[PDB]
Symmetry: C3
């Protein structure tokens, strides 16, 4: 899948799909 | 629900209910 | 169980068994 670790809500074609971290802080994993 | 992100054990009327972070370190989510 | 919070893959006799943190960054929990 194509995924991004996001500061913001998942993009329209994406779904919240797990957990990642940005600088050690929990963040949305967004996948399409 | 009423929840707090705790350094300590959940208070008496609270239950461990998920995961949060305090300054980027995993911590207890306590809810009542 | 005997567990370690690892930067690397779990050792041969170990299995990935949960999540821990090293300096506030998610890491493998490896247990045997
Ligand atoms: Ca963290
Ligand atoms: Cl983002
Ligand atoms: Cl988690
Ligand atoms: Cl507790
Ligand atoms: Cl290690
Ligand atoms: Cl492994
Ligand atoms: Cl791996």
């Amino acid at each position: 899948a194509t995924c991004y670790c996001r500061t913001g809500r998942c993009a329209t074609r994406e779904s919240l799909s797990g957990v990642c971290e940005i600088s050690g802080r929990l963040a949305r994993l967004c996948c399409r």
